């Protein structure tokens, strides 16, 4: 089970890298109600992607 | 499988939704002093005594003094990184703890934060840590039994739902063993359990949790832990957190069992907090209110009548009576049951189980010393069968054990005292029991039957243990219906007495042992 | 620290100043006394064990700015009790009792950038309703906060900064 | 009209205008949120400040709250209307029945009756307990006190005295629970209600859960009802559940009131706080109060300042010891320390007195031999010191007795032994007319005939 | 740092006139009441051991003669007393 | 053994949630500071003073 | 740039006043120029007004008021790792031998939190020391605390050297020796007795002795413990010796009195149990490695109820008692089997065979202890022959607990032996159950395993 879980962890992480960038935007647009564009952040979201 | 990243993401997604950004006003102060875990705050003109003050980081302090121009508070955590000048925010909350049945199976800090790795709690709101127990008119006399696994205490020292029973003895005498065996035995009897560890070594707590999980009980327990390296204000406030988590069940018409691992170390941590505040000490340097400390804690382990449960729960629960049973543990230096803190607690609980080191070194385990140990509620808490078979057995042993003092040299009346000795001695050899091996009231009852009806006067002191093992295997094979009946009821009658005598004559006749 | 031993003296000085409608003169007199307490040489004399009625007279000598009756009498009492070092706090609590008496308050407004002077007008109009008091504002700038504003009025604060929103979101998770 | 300015634990400081400062012991009031908190002032500090003790949970009090000055001390319902009902320290009803229909209310701080009004009585009171009314007989209208460590029998003995004196007594009775278990208060309330004597007993309860102010003033709240019944011309029974908690609650608060500690951390006013209470629990020419008080002694130390100062205020002092209970000898009374003002040849007759002193002499002679027996064994005693020892052990056994309130523990039925029937048994044991019986023939029996009858079964 | 019966209106009196006239060395005013000990302000001519006369017919013994205070013990029931008497 | 496996799964899921959770706020802060402006700042102050 | 100024000096306690916003945090280090040498102060408290109260890690003579004080932003930090083996250091991690600098690359702060609840090892191993008496009668838990209650003249330090040797050779662990408040004379000759036995390159020494100001004697144990933590992080199994834990308590009592805190139970500091726990809770077996500890304990007034022994025994697992007697009889190591105890002796942890073997030899010896009482008063031939067998087996058991150390060769000549646990269980089962009755008792003395006892009987 331990080796199974260590594989599952990568399987999950490599998908959650798609969700980090969505949550990072939704959280800001909740904090700053002037809803924001993706374009100006397209590079920042990429380092958020990478570092996970 | 269950690493469903989709769920992990939607989880946070909901929080981003159910989050309120609107401004809110709060009241502020400045840290003016820091020393040995005590804080002095200037400002907070709107703080209230007993409040939680929120510090930088995710940390809290408890307001103890509202002086004329400053607030005195103790830090609930590592205090070293605080510094004069930091701002603190007054939360409008009196000291609170998460409560609910969703805590079952979690290992938790005294503030309710989960210290195991398994993520945040599911909990039914918060409860106040300092409360006043139900009044005199709300109680009900303790009636129902609480079964440990042990012949010695289930026969001599019965415990009832709603009782408080001090376990006291010297160090390394089996106190923790005798407590977590009682916790383990509730695995199936519908009593939720709570284990509070104050000032214990962290390795000991990790081993206790591992043994609780080994025997399946961990899914039914809450573990509140404040280790030896924790602040003195977390050790001192832990048992109140545990009691706040048990009162949740008590008040909803359910049953709980709570164990305070050391209330000597709580007293020592309170003595520390008190002397650091320059408060004059009394006997043995303990504060004046070291009695009130344990009194207002243990007085919450109660049983409450159905009207209190109805009124508290706004009429949702009818006709049930809740209870909270406490087993505080106290450590006594050199067998001295007459020191300021052991006596303060003997004066609060409804009895005590006294574990004697002389008996424990002589292989007699559990080392229940009769004569010093008693249950102040008495037999009212036992099952009908256990009440019948036991009789005054404990005073019989309490006599035999002093008779062994004078008979040590010589004896007159030297047959009746000879048979008295032989009987008491075989019974003591019969009461000793191995750790982690609980036995149902059916097994204890038929063993006490064998002991009382003279059915063991044949076999040697050397044979007792295998005799009992074979008897409990024989009746496991044959008479499982009668066991299923005595375990289901108080189960005493002349019919059952006959069935037991028949089992006994037959086993002794044809069985191996 | 003299926060506590200053309260009686500030209260007495204010209750006296009111009876005689001289609050402003008393405030300036206390402000001068609390300054002479800070001089390098006088702070040396205040620590050494002189007899009270000698220390008090040497202190009086250094002030012709005190109305010879009522300010010097305050100095003599505080000297008899050994509390001349408390004057810097007597001054603060005198100002506080005054601000209470005249129903006045002073609000700090802290922001990532200076405000548009219409925002300030509405802020003052709002606070003069949150508080009965006519409110001054002291706008201050701090680029740690990055949007919104902090309003601090006494020990009350309204944490309107986005910095606060971020730190308060982080701890929901 | 006043403001709170400090809150230290249970004591609160309040500031009032200079012309309106409350008097000592007047009661104030604060709205502690959705609650009403009563404060009783203890000291008039200078400058309009006043220092008070909270009669309730102090948690949740802010500074600057507004407190209202009630201009009268704490006042409790009193008289016939308070009979069969449970009350707070504040005189509020704590059972779920309606209001107390009292006609009159009394302040709980009162002066003791004058020296001129006191009365003295030689009239002996009989109890079913061998050891008590042999070694320490007590009289109608006098004080009794049960001294003991933790868990030696001073509550069971008081319930037996209640059973043996209070049911067979016509006047009213009062029971004050001062800092003891609420379980026992509920048990006692239901025993009384189920035996239909509750309509003759008034109950005040300030148990150990409550904050210090309640435990501090509940004993005075009970004395006030006992005093009302006394002054009506009646004669009353007053049972106090543990009077030690009344001084312990004072020790807990003393340092916060700003007073220097005394000998073992006790308040400096210990003896006065104790005397001012116990001087008004007395019988007088207009009516009499008979009282039994349990007195906890901490750490079994009979020389601790609190028991030591309490001893002087009692007529009969019964001293319970752990070293006797551990032998299973109940009631665990120590007959070489129990004493009574009533044990005189003039009061109890020459035979009772002479038997009591003979018992004391034998038991003390036995104490003197316990060290030589410990070192050199019993075979080194002279032929008659062995006789002293055997009779001493028989007497030790015979002072044991079964109680009606201990059936729950031992199953054996209770026994009631009349005085005439016990001085005869002890005269017998001492004179030598029962040497044949074994020691265990005397353990846990009633009259002596039960001992000679028990010997037949070993 | 703690006060010694320096309190608002007593201080204000001195603000008005520090060298208060010698109005009466014979009398004073109670400023504190607690546990049977009262602190008296004034009584410049009190002597140690002297009997001080209170309202009613009651007395106190002056035992502490300090800098601006007399500590005296009441010889009877004290709870009736009150500041300012 | 079968309950130790489940405890390991819970613990791993929690650590993954923790990582994503803190990256969310770090990203939101960077997006905010890269996208806040006077037009929105004035609107935030207007909002809060409208309910101050 | 320095910012503080000394404002008070009273004995070892120094107060310094900083700018109102730059106040140091607790346990931060400061330094001042005490004339021609610098001095390090450790913050203990923050008083109001920017003042901070400290304790001097050195002699405070010559300190003026108004000296400039420099605020180092971090606690006392010491050098750690392989670089510190065979060196001697004081509290501040400065080389105190003359061999020059310490070539470490990493420095750690001595104040740290104990391992969290989920870092602790979810197992319970045993530490095979290779000594017969210890591994039979008082086994060590890996990551446990061991008391060592011997007096003087019995070989405590040669036992320590033997453990240091075995855990380095037969395992791959290093050792750390922390000298808390004991004689300098003993430290010099421990250094030499180790250097001339070639173990000095396997132990890291740190010393704060009785001549040191209180702060040094207080924090030296934490210095040693943090070096042992650095070794643990490498995955090793480490052994930490404390020269006297009682003096670690007494240094804290002195410091507490200096800070003016109210005294407690028998005069001790109010924070006795927490000062003890925050040390004893850092030496545990972790998922990566483990620190075992052997601590010499002195019991005041021979009272095991005194708060200091009572607090220490709450943490000890094993307990070995050395006895002058067992040494007089010529048996080394001079461990007493009847008072030595370990709470690892349970069937549920150590096994049933080892448990009942230890209990066997215990009962045999504690009967022999009184058969030899009879023999003294009534002579040998008074005994039943059921007893003349017990005496002859007890004498052989008593001999077989001796052992030759690799460190004792300089005395005994005989080569040192490392005895596995299995071998000891075999040997004592044998001797107890009457096997080997046919060979004389001196065939067991100082032999090693039993397979060597048979040979020594062959060539006898
Ligand atoms: N019924 C029993 N039979 C055999 N051994 C027992 C029994 N109960 C306890 N023990 C043993 O007693 C030892 C100590 O027990 P335990 O740790 O529960 O006591 P304790 O009082 O909690 O000790 P401490 O005070 O150090 O926590 C354990 O090693 C255990 O093996
Ligand atoms: N007469 C008695 N017979 C038998 N047991 C008794 C008797 N009196 C006291 N005991 C025992 O002593 C225990 C202590 O109870 P209690 O009298 O309530 O102590 P305390 O005085 O502290 O309340 C009782 O629960 C019972 O076990
Ligand atoms: N294992 C051993 N083999 C031989 N001799 C030993 C052994 N252990 C101790 N001794 C003897 O006992 C002495 C004890 O001296 P030392 O180690 O300094 O003891 P302590 O540290 O208690 O003063 C040794 O020098 C040696 O003479
Ligand atoms: Mg334990
Ligand atoms: Mg009682």
- 3-state helix/strand/coil string of G170-224: CCCCCEEEEEECCCHHHHHHHHHHHHCCCCHHHEEEEEECCCCCHHHHHHHHHHH
Cα–chain center distance at G450 = 30
Q: Where are any strands of DSSP class E within G286-334?
A: 290-296, 318-320
Bridge-based pairing of strands B221-226 and B192-198 is parallel
Looking at the partner chain, which of F33, F38, F45 has a beta carbon nearest the beta carbon of C148? Answer: F45
Q: Identify the residue whose tokens are 């004896």.
A: B411
Rounded CA gap, C99 and C102, in Å? Answer: 5
Ligand in nearest proximity to the CA of G350: 1
| Residue D43, number of CB atoms within 10 A of its CB | 20
- Ligand 3 atom nearest to CA at G158: 17
The CATH number for C47's domain is: 1.10.520.20
What are the backbone angles phi and psi of residue B114, rounded to the nearest 5°? -75, 125
C68-80 burial, b at 16+ Cβ within 10 Å, e below that, comes to eebbbbbbbbbbb
By the 8 A CB rule, do G284 and B203 touch?
yes
> Is there a contact between B430 and B456 (Cβ–Cβ < 8 Å)?
yes
Range of the domain at C67: 6-100
Ligand 4 midpoint to CA B176 (Å)? 4
Is the minimum distance from the CB of G332 to ligand 3 under 6 angstroms? yes
Q: Which two tokens stand for residue D74?
A: 């704490």
In contact, F20 and A20? CB cutoff 8 Å? yes
CATH 2.40.30.20 positions along chain B are 24-93
Task: Look up tokens 């546990």; give the residue.
Answer: E35
Separation CA D422–CA C16 (nearest Å)? 83
Sign of CA dihedral B478, B481, B484, B485: negative
Q: Which of G163, G123, G94 is nearest to G335 (CA)?
A: G163
Which sign does the torsion angle of CA D447, D448, D452, D458 carry? positive
CA-only gyration radius of chain E, Å: 13
Residues paired with D240 in a beta bridge? D176, D293
Residues facing residue B88 across a β-bridge: B29
Architecture of domain B24-93: Beta Barrel (2.40)
Mutate to test the pocket of ligand 1, among B152, B177, B438 (most ligand atoms within 8 A of CB): B177
G345-460 maps to CATH 1.10.1140.10: yes
Q: Where are the beta strands (DSSP E) in G117-186?
A: 126-127, 140-141, 145-148, 175-180
User: In this complex, how many residue pairs, one in chain B and one in chain G, have their CB atoms less than 8 Å apart?
Assistant: 121
Strand-strand pairing, C156-159 and B25-35: antiparallel
**Interface B-F: count of C-beta contacts within 8 A:** 36
Q: Do B305 and D225 contact (CB within 8 A), yes or no?
A: no
For residue B60, give every residue at least 6 positions away whose Cβ sits within 8 Å of its Cβ, in sequence order, or none.
B52, B53, B54, B76, B77, B111
Return d(Cα B33, Cα B40) in angstroms, integer. 5
Please state which of the four CATH numbers 3.40.1440.10, 3.60.20.10, 3.30.930.10, 3.40.50.300 is assigned to the domain occupying B94-382. Answer: 3.40.50.300
CA-based torsion, D429, D433, D434, D436: positive or negative: positive
Q: Which residues of G278-303 are buried (b: 16+ CB within 10 A; e: fewer)?
A: bbbbbbbbbeebbbbbbbbbbbeeee
Are D185 and B136 an interchain contact pair (Cβ–Cβ within 8 Å)?
yes
Longest dimension (CA), chain A: 47
DSSP string of B309-346, one letter each residue: HHHHTTTSS-S---EEEE--EEE-GGG-S-SHHHHHHH
Spatial distance between the Cα atoms of C117 and D311, rounded to a whole number of angstroms: 80
Give the residue ranges of DSSP H helices in chain C.
Answer: 7-19, 23-36, 40-45, 52-61, 70-80, 87-101, 119-130, 162-170
Angle CA(G100)–CA(G106)–CA(G110) in degrees, nearest 5? 95
CA atoms of C89 and B393, how far apart (whole Å): 76
Q: How far apart are CA F25 and CA F44, in angstroms?
A: 20
Q: At what angle do helices D385-398 and D345-368 cross, to 10 degrees?
A: 120
G151 CB under 6 A from ligand 3?
A: no
Nearest Cα to Cα of residue F17 among G460, B11, E29:
B11
Of G228, D377, D41, give the one whose Cα is nearest residue B406. Answer: D377
Preceding omega of D331 cis (within 30 degrees of 0):
yes
Catalytic status, residue G73: no
User: Residue D174: beta bridge partners?
Assistant: D202, D238
Burial class (CB in 10 A: 0-12, 13-18, 19+), C111: buried
Q: Which of G96, G5, G3, G8 is nearest to G60 (CA)?
A: G8
Answer whether C touches B (≥3 Cβ pairs < 8 Å).
Answer: yes
- The CB density around residue C140, as the number of other CB atoms within 10 Å, is 12
Judge contact between D240 and D294, C-beta under 8 A: yes
N residues, chain C: 173
Q: What is the DSSP letter of D114?
A: P
Q: Strand D235-240 and strand D173-178: pairing?
A: parallel
Q: Is D298 exposed, middle or buried (0-12, 13-18, 19+ CB in 10 A)?
A: buried
- Element housing D177 (H / E): strand D173-178
* Structure-derived torsion over alpha carbons of residues A30, A35, A41, A45, reported in degrees to the nearest 10: 30
Name which of G283, D62, D447 is nearest B202 in CA terms. G283
Q: Residue D220 to residues B165, D109, D241, E35, G52: CA-CA distances in angstroms?
A: 32, 7, 13, 18, 50
Q: Which residue in the block uniquely carries the two structure tokens 């058969």?
A: G371
Distance from CA of D132 to the nearest CA of B (A): 23
Query: Half-sphere exposure of residue B85, counting CA atoms within 13 Å on the CB side?
Result: 12
Query: Nearest Cα to G202, choosing from G240, G176, G224?
Result: G176
Q: Going by CA atoms, what residue is nearest to atom 11 of ligand 3?
A: G155
Tokens matching residue G173? 């662990």
Tell me which CATH homologous superfamily contains domain G76-344.
P-loop containing nucleotide triphosphate hydrolases (3.40.50.300)
Residue B354 in contact with residue B166, Cβ under 8 Å? no
Q: Which segments within B103-261 are labelled E, that is strand?
A: 107-108, 126-128, 145-146, 159-160, 166-169, 192-198, 221-226, 255-260
The token pair that represents C72 in the structure block: 């010097």
Per CATH, is G1-75 categorized as 2.40.10.170? Answer: yes
Q: Over the range B366-393, which residues count as b (16 or more CB within 10 Å of their CB) and which as e?
A: bbbbbbbbbbbbbbbbbbebbbbbbeeb
Rounded to the nearest 10°, the torsion over CA B268, B274, B276, B278 is: -140
User: For the CA atoms of G313, G314, G317, G323, what is the dihedral angle to 10 degrees?
Assistant: 10
Residue G456's alpha-carbon distances to D93, D151, G331, G400, in angstroms, are 91, 65, 17, 12
* Region D1-73: CATH code: 2.40.10.170
- Proximal ligand: closest to the CA of G406: 3
Q: Which chains touch B (3 or more CB pairs under 8 A)?
A: A, C, D, F, G
Residues A15, A11: Cα–Cα separation, whole Å:
7
What is d(CA D266, CA D274) in angstroms, rounded to the nearest whole number?
12
Q: Is G406 in the pocket of ligand 3 (CB under 6 A)?
A: no
In DSSP terms, D288 is beta-bridged to: D235
**R_g of chain D, CA atoms, integer Å:** 25
Domain ranges of chain D: 1-73, 74-342, 343-458
φ/ψ region of D213 (left if φ > 0, alpha if ψ in -120 to 50, else beta) reads alpha
Asked if C147 and C164 count as a contact pair (C-beta separation under 8 A), the reply is no
CA distance C107 to C109: 6
- Give the Å distances, CA to CA, from G347 to A18, B214, D52, G118, G359: 54, 18, 61, 27, 11
Backbone angles phi, psi at D155, to 5 degrees: -95, -40
Per-residue DSSP letter, B434: -
Inter-chain contact F7–B23, Cβ cutoff 8 Å? no
The answer, for C158 touching chain B at a CB cutoff of 8 Å, is yes
With CA atoms as reference, the chain B residue closest to D439 would be B413
Q: Token match 């000549």: residue?
A: G413
Burial B94-106 (b: 16+ CB within 10 A, else e): bbbbbbbeebebb
Question: Nearest CA to G427 among G395, G454, G391?
Answer: G454
Q: And the tokens for B14? A: 């909901």
- The size of chain G, in residues, is 460
- Name G46's bridge partners: B34, G52
CA–CA separation, B215 and G143 (whole Å) = 25
Report phi then psi at G58, rounded to 5: 170, 180
Chains F and D touch (3+ CB pairs under 8 A): no
> DSSP string covering D340-405, please?
ETT-SHHHHHHHHHHHHHHHHHHHHHHHHTHHHHHHH-GGGS-TTHHHHHHHHHHHHHHT----GG
Could you say which residues from 18 to 47 on chain A have a Cβ atom under 8 Å away from some Cβ of chain F? 19-21, 23-25, 27-28, 31-34, 36-37, 40-41, 44-45
Q: D128, D131, D151, D411: which to mutate for ligand 2, most atoms within 8 A of CB?
A: D151
- Which among B76, B1, B75, B7 has a CA at the least distance from the CA of B35? B75
Rounded to whole angstroms, the Cα distance separating G105 from G82 reads 10
CA dihedral for G74, G75, G76, G79, sign (positive or negative): negative
Residue B172 to residue G83: CA distance in whole angstroms: 42
Nearest by CB to D269, from E9, E35, E79: name it: E35
Shortest-distance Cα residue to atom 10 of ligand 3: G155
Query: Resolution of the coordinates in A?
Result: 3.1
Give, in degrees to the nearest 5, the angle at Cα G431 between G426 and G432. Answer: 100
Q: Is G107 a catalytic residue?
A: no
Q: Do chains E and G touch (3 or more CB pairs under 8 A)?
A: no
Choices 1.20.150.20, 3.40.47.10, 3.40.50.1220, 1.10.150.120: CATH for B383-513: 1.20.150.20
G156 is catalytic: yes
Whether residue G326 contacts residue G336, with contact meaning beta carbons closer than 8 Å, is answered with yes
CB atoms within 10 A of CB D64: 12
Q: ∠ at Cα G345 (G340, G349), nearest 5°? A: 155
The CA-CA-CA angle for residues G113, G117, G121, to 5°, reads 105
CA dist B408 → B400, B421, D395 (Å): 12, 11, 24
SS3 category, F49 = helix
The two three-digit tokens of residue G292, written as one number: 């075992």
- Residue G101's Cβ-count burial label (10 Å; 0-12, 13-18, 19+) is exposed
B345: its two tokens: 């607690």
Q: B312-315: long-range contacts (C-beta < 8 A, 24 or more apart)? A: B312/B251, B313/B251, B313/B252, B313/B253
- d(Cα G198, Cα G265) in Å, to the nearest integer? 46
Ligand closest in space to the Cα of B431: 1
Judging contacts by C-beta atoms under 8 Å, the chain E residues touching residue C5 are 1-3
CA distance E40 to E29: 6
Burial class (CB in 10 A: 0-12, 13-18, 19+), G456: middle
CA dist D361 and D453 (Å) reads 28
Contact E35 D43 (CB under 8 A): yes
Say if strands B107-108 and B87-94 run parallel, antiparallel, or are unpaired. Answer: unpaired
Ligand 1 within 6 A of CB of B417: no
Element (H, E) at B292: helix B290-298
Token readout for D360 is 């004391």
DSSP labels, C107-133: EEEEESS---SSHHHHHHHHHHHHSSS
DSSP tag of G58: S
**Pocket of ligand 1 contains residue B366 by CB under 6 Å:** yes
Nearest to A36 by CA among B8, F23, C167, C162: C162
Question: Sign of torsion, CA C77 C83 C85 C86?
Answer: negative
| CATH fold label, D74-342 | Rossmann fold (3.40.50)
B134 phi-psi bin (left φ>0, alpha ψ -120 to 50, beta other): beta
Q: Quote the tokens at residue D443.
A: 């353990």
Distance in angstroms (rounded) separating the CA atoms of residues D180 and D409: 21
DSSP H stretches of helix in D200-269 = 212-231, 244-254
CA-to-CA dists, residue B355 to B330, B501, D286, angstroms? 11, 34, 55
How many Å apart are CA B143 and CA B157, to the nearest integer? 14
Helix (H) or strand (E) holding D104: strand D104-107
Of G17, G42, G77, G182, which residue is the catalytic one? G182
What is the greatest pairwise CA distance in chain C? 66
Output Rg (C-alpha) for chain G, integer angstroms.
25
The CATH number of domain D343-458 is 3.20.20.10? no
CATH code for E1-85? 2.40.30.20
Q: Please provide residue B306's backbone torsions phi and psi, each rounded to the nearest 5 degrees.
A: -65, -25
Pocket flag, ligand 2, residue D188 (CB < 6 Å): no
């Amino acid at each position: 089970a331990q080796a199974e879980i260590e594989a599952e962890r990568k399987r999950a992480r490599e998908e959650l890298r798609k969700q980090v960038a969505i949550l990072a935007v939704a959280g800001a647009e909740k904090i700053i109600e002037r809803s924001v564009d993706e374009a100006a952040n397209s590079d920042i979201v990429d380092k958020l992607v990478a570092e996970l | 499988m269950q690493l469903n990243s989709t769920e992990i993401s939607e989880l946070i997604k909901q929080r981003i939704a159910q989050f309120n950004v609107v401004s809110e006003a709060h009241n502020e102060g400045t840290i003016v002093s820091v020393s040995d875990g005590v804080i002095r705050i200037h400002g907070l003109a709107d703080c209230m005594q007993g409040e939680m003050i929120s510090l930088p980081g995710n940390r809290y302090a408890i307001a103890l003094n509202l002086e004329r121009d400053s607030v005195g508070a103790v830090v609930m955590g590592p205090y070293a990184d605080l510094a004069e000048g930091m701002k603190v925010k007054c939360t409008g909350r009196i000291l609170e703890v998460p409560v609910g049945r969703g805590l079952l199976g979690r290992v938790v800090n005294t503030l309710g934060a989960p210290i195991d790795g398994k993520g945040p709690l599911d909990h039914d709101g918060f409860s106040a840590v300092e409360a006043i127990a139900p009044g005199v008119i709300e109680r009900q006399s303790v009636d129902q039994p609480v079964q440990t696994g042990y012949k010695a205490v289930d026969s001599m020292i019965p415990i009832g739902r709603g009782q408080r029973e001090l376990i006291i003895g010297d160090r390394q005498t089996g106190k923790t063993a005798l407590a977590i065996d009682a916790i383990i035995n509730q695995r199936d009897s519908g009593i939720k359990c709570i284990y509070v560890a104050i000032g214990q070594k962290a390795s000991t707590i990790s081993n206790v949790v591992r043994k609780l999980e080994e025997h399946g009980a961990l899914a039914n327990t809450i573990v509140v832990v404040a280790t030896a390296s924790e602040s003195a204000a977390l050790q001192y406030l832990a048992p109140y957190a545990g009691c706040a988590m048990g009162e949740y069940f008590r008040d909803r018409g359910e049953d709980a069992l709570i164990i305070y691992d050391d209330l000597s170390k709580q007293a020592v941590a309170y003595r520390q907090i008190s002397l650091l505040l320059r408060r004059p000490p009394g006997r043995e340097a303990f504060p004046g209110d070291v009695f009130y400390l344990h009194s207002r804690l243990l007085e919450r382990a109660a049983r409450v009548n159905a009207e209190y449960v109805e009124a508290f729960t706004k009429g949702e629960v009818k006709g049930k009576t809740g209870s909270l049973t406490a087993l505080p543990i106290i450590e006594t230096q050199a067998g001295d049951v007459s020191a300021f803190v052991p006596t303060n607690v003997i004066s609060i609980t409804d009895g005590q189980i006294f574990l004697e080191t002389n008996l424990f070194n002589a292989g007699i385990r559990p080392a229940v010393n009769p004569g010093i140990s008693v249950s102040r509620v008495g037999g009212a808490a036992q099952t009908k069968i256990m009440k019948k078979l036991s009789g005054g057995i404990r005073t019989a042993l309490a006599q035999y054990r002093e008779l062994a003092a004078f008979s040590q040299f010589a004896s007159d009346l030297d047959d009746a005292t000879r048979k008295q000795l032989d009987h008491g001695q075989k019974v003591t050899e019969l009461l000793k029991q191995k750790q982690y091996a609980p036995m149902s009231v059916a097994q204890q009852s038929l063993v006490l039957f064998a002991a009382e009806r003279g059915y063991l006067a044949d076999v040697e002191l050397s044979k007792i243990g295998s005799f009992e093992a074979a008897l409990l295997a024989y009746v496991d094979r044959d008479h499982a219906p009668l066991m299923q009946e005595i375990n289901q009821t108080g189960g005493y009658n002349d019919e059952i007495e006959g069935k037991l005598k028949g089992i006994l004559d037959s086993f002794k006749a044809t069985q191996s042992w | 620290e003299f926060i506590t031993v200053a309260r009686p003296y500030a209260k007495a000085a204010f209750d006296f100043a009111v009876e005689h409608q001289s609050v402003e003169r008393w405030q300036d007199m206390l402000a001068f006394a609390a300054e002479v307490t800070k001089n390098e040489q006088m702070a040396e004399l205040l620590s050494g064990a002189l007899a009270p009625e000698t220390l008090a007279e040497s202190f009086i000598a250094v002030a012709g700015e005190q109305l010879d009756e009522n300010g010097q009498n305050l100095i003599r009492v505080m000297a008899e009790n050994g509390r001349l070092n408390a004057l810097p706090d007597v001054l603060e609590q005198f100002i506080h009792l005054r601000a209470v008496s005249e129903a006045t308050a002073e609000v700090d407004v802290i922001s990532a950038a200076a405000l548009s002077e219409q925002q300030l007008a509405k802020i003052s109009a709002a606070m003069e309703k949150r508080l009965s008091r006519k409110v001054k504002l002291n706008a201050k700038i701090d680029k740690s906060v990055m949007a919104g504003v902090i309003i601090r009025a006494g020990d009350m604060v309204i944490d309107g900064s986005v910095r606060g929103r971020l730190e308060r979101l982080a701890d929901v998770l | 009209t006043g403001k709170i300015v400090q809150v230290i634990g249970a004591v609160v400081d309040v500031e009032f205008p200079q012309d309106a400062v409350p008097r000592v012991y007047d009661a104030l009031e604060v709205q502690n949120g959705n609650e009403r908190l009563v404060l009783e002032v203890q000291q008039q500090l200078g400058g309009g400040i006043v220092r008070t003790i909270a009669m309730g949970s102090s948690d949740g009090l802010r500074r600057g709250l507004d407190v209202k000055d009630l201009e009268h001390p704490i006042e409790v319902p009193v008289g016939k209307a308070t009979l069969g009902r449970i009350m707070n320290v504040l005189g509020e009803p704590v059972d779920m029945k309606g209001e107390i229909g009292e006609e009159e209310r009394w302040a709980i701080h009162r002066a003791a009756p004058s020296y001129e009004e006191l009365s003295n009585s030689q009239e002996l009171l009989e109890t079913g307990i061998k050891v008590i009314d042999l070694m320490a007989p007590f009289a109608k209208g006098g004080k009794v006190g049960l001294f003991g460590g933790a868990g030696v029998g001073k509550t069971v003995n008081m319930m037996e005295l209640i059973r043996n004196i209070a049911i067979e007594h016509s006047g009213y009775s009062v029971f004050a629970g001062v800092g003891e278990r609420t379980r026992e208060g509920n048990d006692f309330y239901h025993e009384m209600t189920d035996s239909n004597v509750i309509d003759k007993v008034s109950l005040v309860y300030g148990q150990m859960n409550e904050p210090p102010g309640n435990r501090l003033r509940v004993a005075l709240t009970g004395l006030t009802m006992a005093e009302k019944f006394r002054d009506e011309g009646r004669d009353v029974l007053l049972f106090v559940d543990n009077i030690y908690r009344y001084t312990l609650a004072g020790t807990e608060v003393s340092a916060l009131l700003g007073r220097m500690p005394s000998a073992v951390g006790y308040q400096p006013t210990l003896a006065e706080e104790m005397g001012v209470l116990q001087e008004r629990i007395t019988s007088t020419k207009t009516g009499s109060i008979t009282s039994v008080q349990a007195v906890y002694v901490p750490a079994d130390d009979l020389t601790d300042p609190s028991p030591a100062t309490t001893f002087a205020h009692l007529d009969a002092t019964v001293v319970l010891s752990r070293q006797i209970a551990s032998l299973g000898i109940y009631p665990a009374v120590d007959p070489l320390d129990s004493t009574s003002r009533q044990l005189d040849p003039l009061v109890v007759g020459q035979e009772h007195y002479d038997t009591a002193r003979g018992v004391q002499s034998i038991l003390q002679r036995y104490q003197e031999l316990k060290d030589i027996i410990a070192i050199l064994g019993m075979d080194e005693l002279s032929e008659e010191d062995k006789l002293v020892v055997a009779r001493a052990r028989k007497i030790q056994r015979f002072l044991s007795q079964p109680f009606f309130v201990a059936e729950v523990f031992t199953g054996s039925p209770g026994k009631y032994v009349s005085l005439k029937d016990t001085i005869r048994g002890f005269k017998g044991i001492m004179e030598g007319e029962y040497d044949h019986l074994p020691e265990q023939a005397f353990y846990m029996v009633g009259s002596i005939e039960e001992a000679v009858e028990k010997a037949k079964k070993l």
